Amino acid sequence: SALFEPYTLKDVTLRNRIAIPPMCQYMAEDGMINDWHHVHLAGLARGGAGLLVVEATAVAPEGRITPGCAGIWSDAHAQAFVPVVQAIKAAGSVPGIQIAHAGRKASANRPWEGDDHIAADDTRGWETIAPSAIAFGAHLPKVPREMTLDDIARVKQDFVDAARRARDAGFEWIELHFAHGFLGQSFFSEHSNKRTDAYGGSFDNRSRFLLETLAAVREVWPENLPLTARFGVLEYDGRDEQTLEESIELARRFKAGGLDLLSVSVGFTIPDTNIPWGPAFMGPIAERVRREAKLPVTSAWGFGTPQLAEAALQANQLDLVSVGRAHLADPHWAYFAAKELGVEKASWTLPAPYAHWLE
Amino acid sequence: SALFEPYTLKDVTLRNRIAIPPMCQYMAEDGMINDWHHVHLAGLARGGAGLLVVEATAVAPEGRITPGCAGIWSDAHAQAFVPVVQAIKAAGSVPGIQIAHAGRKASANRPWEGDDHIAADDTRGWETIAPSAIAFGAHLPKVPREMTLDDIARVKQDFVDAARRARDAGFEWIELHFAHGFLGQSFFSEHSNKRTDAYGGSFDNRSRFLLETLAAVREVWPENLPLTARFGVLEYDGRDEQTLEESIELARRFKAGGLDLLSVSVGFTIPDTNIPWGPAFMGPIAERVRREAKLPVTSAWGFGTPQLAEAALQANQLDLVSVGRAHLADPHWAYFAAKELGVEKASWTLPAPYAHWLE
Ligand SMILES: Cc1cc2nc3c(=O)[nH]c(=O)nc-3n(C[C@H](O)[C@H](O)[C@H](O)COP(=O)(O)O)c2cc1C
Ligand SMILES: Cc1cc2nc3c(=O)[nH]c(=O)nc-3n(C[C@H](O)[C@H](O)[C@H](O)COP(=O)(O)O)c2cc1C
Numbered sequence: 001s002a003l004f005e006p007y008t009l010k011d012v013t014l015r016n017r018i019a020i021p022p023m024c025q026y027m028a029e030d031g032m033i034n035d036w037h038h039v040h041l042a043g044l045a046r047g048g049a050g051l052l053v054v055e056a057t058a059v060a061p062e063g064r065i066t067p068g069c070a071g072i073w074s075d076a077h078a079q080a081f082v083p084v085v086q087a088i089k090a091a092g093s094v095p096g097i098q099i100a101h102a103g104r105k106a107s108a109n110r111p112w113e114g115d116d117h118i119a120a121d122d123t124r125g126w127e128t129i130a131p132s133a134i135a136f137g138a139h140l141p142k143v144p145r146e147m148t149l150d151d152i153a154r155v156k157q158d159f160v161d162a163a164r165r166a167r168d169a170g171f172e173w174i175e176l177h178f179a180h181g182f183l184g185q186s187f188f189s190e191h192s193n194k195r196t197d198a199y200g201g202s203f204d205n206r207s208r209f210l211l212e213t214l215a216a217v218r219e220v221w222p223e224n225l226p227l228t229a230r231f232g233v234l235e236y237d238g239r240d241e242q243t244l245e246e247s248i249e250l251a252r253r254f255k256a257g258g259l260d261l262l263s264v265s266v267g268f269t270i271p272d273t274n275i276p277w278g279p280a281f282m283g284p285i286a287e288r289v290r291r292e293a294k295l296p297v298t299s300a301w302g303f304g305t306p307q308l309a310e311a312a313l314q315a316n317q318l319d320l321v322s323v324g325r326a327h328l329a330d331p332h333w334a335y336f337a338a339k340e341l342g343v344e345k346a347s348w349t350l351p352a353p354y355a356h357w358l359e
Numbered sequence: 360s361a362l363f364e365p366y367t368l369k370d371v372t373l374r375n376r377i378a379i380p381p382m383c384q385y386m387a388e389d390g391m392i393n394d395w396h397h398v399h400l401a402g403l404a405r406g407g408a409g410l411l412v413v414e415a416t417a418v419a420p421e422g423r424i425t426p427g428c429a430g431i432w433s434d435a436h437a438q439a440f441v442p443v444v445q446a447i448k449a450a451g452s453v454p455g456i457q458i459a460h461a462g463r464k465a466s467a468n469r470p471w472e473g474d475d476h477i478a479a480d481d482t483r484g485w486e487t488i489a490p491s492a493i494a495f496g497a498h499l500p501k502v503p504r505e506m507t508l509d510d511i512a513r514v515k516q517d518f519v520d521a522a523r524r525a526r527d528a529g530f531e532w533i534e535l536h537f538a539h540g541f542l543g544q545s546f547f548s549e550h551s552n553k554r555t556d557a558y559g560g561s562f563d564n565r566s567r568f569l570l571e572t573l574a575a576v577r578e579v580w581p582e583n584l585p586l587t588a589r590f591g592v593l594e595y596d597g598r599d600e601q602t603l604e605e606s607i608e609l610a611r612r613f614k615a616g617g618l619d620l621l622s623v624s625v626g627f628t629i630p631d632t633n634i635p636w637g638p639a640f641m642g643p644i645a646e647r648v649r650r651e652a653k654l655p656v657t658s659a660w661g662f663g664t665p666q667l668a669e670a671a672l673q674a675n676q677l678d679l680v681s682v683g684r685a686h687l688a689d690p691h692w693a694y695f696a697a698k699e700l701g702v703e704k705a706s707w708t709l710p711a712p713y714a715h716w717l718e
């Protein structure tokens with residue numbers, strides 16, 4: 001099975017091509033993770049996936065999506081990850097982390113607590129920042145504050161510090177969150193970036209925050225560990241061919257700047273779109289990026305059945321298959337997949353105290 | 360659905376009728392549990408089952424099955440359970456524990472490390488104890504040492520101390536392991552008990568160790584928390600009707616002695632048997648015990664599909680359905696079952712960070 005072939009990137013070898021993508025849990029308190037996360041993550045690692053990427057972890061308090069988001073904006077926050085990292089490694093999975101800044105989509109309620117921008121008089125909320133003072137709209141009506149150059153320098157440094165902390169906590173894989181309408185994506189998109197300085201207008205200027213952040217992170221992140229990013233390569237906003245062309249150009253600049261793998265996603269930059277959700281719908285888009293930027297890729301949003309995952313790999317659309325919601329339903333999804341695909345000794349996807357009995 | 364109706368026994372209410380029976384993990388070191396157990400158990404609790412019974416936990420070092428078995432023979436061993444108990448409760452499951460003594464089946468290898476009695480010159484092994492100096496045979500050839508009266512008094516006290524420790528660690532449900540050919544079962548069975556003192560010969564004498572241990576435990580275990588036992592009610596050894604009759608009589612004496620629920624199992628006392636393994640095969644036996652001893656029951660060994668579990672409850676064969684191996688395969692089996700049985704808001708079997716996304 002292609003799904004169960006190992007994958008080596010830099011000095012890291014994943015035992016199979018199943019990646020668990022970042023999935024916010026909304027269970028942290030002032031950014032500090034706890035036993036929710038410990039058990040959740042260690043349990044997923046034991047389920048057999050080759051790579052487990054920890055949820056969007058904010059580089060700064062105001063860059064959380066919600067009051068429940070994880071953070072890594074101080075050394076104490078970073079140290080809270082150490083036992084989790086160690087548990088993931090003990091289970092034979094590779095520990096990764098997505099470092100993030102929610103930009104104009106920050107200061108929101110948890111998804112089961114309204115999913116909308118927090119009210120102005122709620123003591124939990126905070127001012128959001130973005131490239132331009134323009135609201136997302138819909139359920140996220142807050143107008144963010146337009147960043148100064150000093151704010152840009154500060155946020156870049158926060159990404160550097162977060163990467164250094166992730167390194168020192170023992171993570172073996174990092175993902176910069178430049179997708180999903182959050183800060184990085186919003187610098188790239190003309191919908192959200194109306195700046196007239198060096199950080200807006202032209203393709204080079206809109207790319208600048210992302211490329212400078214990647215370069216700054218690269219200074220502290222080890223050369224021998226995968227340096228990756230998530231990026232929304234189209235919006236489904238009626239501008240897809242032009243947007244894809246630019247996104248692929250940016251992916252070439254990421255590759256030239258040391259990016260080892262790109263997690264290909266959708267922008268979610270604005271609400272007025274028509275995303276064609278369906279099984280493996282991102283496969284052709286991911287394949288195009290892979291081919292035209294000559295960069296390894298992963299993607300998600302509908303690959304969570306064993307045959308879809310296998311087919312995407314065999315067609316060289318993806319290098320890793322990210323499987324999200326199926327792992328919330330069943331932490332041992334990799335074992336399920338091994339069985340489905342007829343892998344020999346499928347139960348030994350799991351550790352001995354499970355595998356022995358499930359042969 | 361019957362499977363998702365709550366159950367109240369003494370002061371404890373289970374959110375549904377799914378019980379996770381004790382399942383040895385073979386991951387402890389000198390009886391001390393660790394992060395293997397913490398994550399395993401907390402993950403199962405979050406999966407939705409109403410009751411989670413911790414694996415056979417030895418009351419004394421020599422009562423472990425293997426060098427990997429959990430123990431509770433000192434206060435330090437007990438204190439290791441405290442954070443696990445707290446995690447199980449945080450997830451809304453009821454924490455139980457099975458306290459045990461392996462008798463002649465002790466000093467064995469882990470099941471994936473030979474499953475047989477440990478060699479005499481292996482520094483890990485130890486002398487086994489039993490009612491009589493008679494080996495199990497087959498892969499367990501060691502002849503145990505015949506217990507003295509003082510040994511009987513000491514082991515009973517070890518069960519008392521274990522129960523007191525379980526209570527003080529915060530467990531809300533206890534199960535005495537009088538099944539599976541281990542020490543208690545072996546006192547009951549004429550195959551293994553050839554004693555000619557007060558603890559062998561007649562039905563009363565063979566029952567005595569079990570009834571005295573139950574009574575001693577009852578002195579320290581709170582009246583308001585379920586006091587349960589597991590007991591093999593037949594062997595499939597050609598003596599089933601006579602054995603079942605005696606087992607049911609003993610179950611009546613357990614009930615009279617304060618037992619709140621009986622986990623009905625098979626004896627496994629000797630190897631030369633013909634157990635008719637199959638789906639729900641224990642249902643009729645459990646039902647007979649339930650009816651003739653007028654005692655709530657659970658059972659296992661083939662109820663691990665949602666329809667089998669539901670059918671057993673609706674037929675009043677069982678009060679709780681114990682589902683073991685299916686939970687090793689999928690820690691979220693209760694969610695799977697809720698979906699299968701068409702329970703409303705089935706995803707909310709799981710906590711919000713999963714449930715919200717799986718609606
Ligand atoms: C609970 C939940 C939380 C998520 N949090 C993040 C996140 O932290 N960062 C991110 O880039 N994507 C996040 N996503 C998107 C997932 O990584 C993934 O792309 C999505 O679940 C689609 O894949 P699937 O169809 O296999 O579920 C999240 C999705 C879910 C369901
Ligand atoms: C891994 C494993 C370990 C077990 N350990 C114990 C134990 O500690 N005590 C016990 O009474 N039964 C033990 N059993 C028996 C289970 O509780 C249960 O009866 C058995 O798994 C049958 O139920 P199932 O068909 O749902 O798996 C164990 C079974 C398994 C698979």
Ligand SMILES: O=c1ccc2ccc(O)cc2o1
Binds near residue numbers: 046087090351
């Ligand atoms: O998969 C594993 C195997 C062993 C193991 C052992 C200890 C522990 O804390 C975690 C573990 O994860």
Ligand SMILES: O=c1ccc2ccc(O)cc2o1
Binds near residue numbers: 024056179180
């Ligand atoms: O579908 C989701 C749910 C939460 C979520 C949170 C962050 C993100 O980047 C993407 C997300 O997608």
Ligand SMILES: O=c1ccc2ccc(O)cc2o1
Binds near residue numbers: 034449451710
């Ligand atoms: O099911 C739960 C819900 C919340 C929760 C919160 C913290 C924790 O440590 C464990 C938990 O288990």
Ligand SMILES: O=c1ccc2ccc(O)cc2o1
Binds near residue numbers: 383415538539
């Ligand atoms: O099937 C099993 C495997 C291990 C095991 C261990 C203890 C016990 O009481 C019963 C058991 O049944």
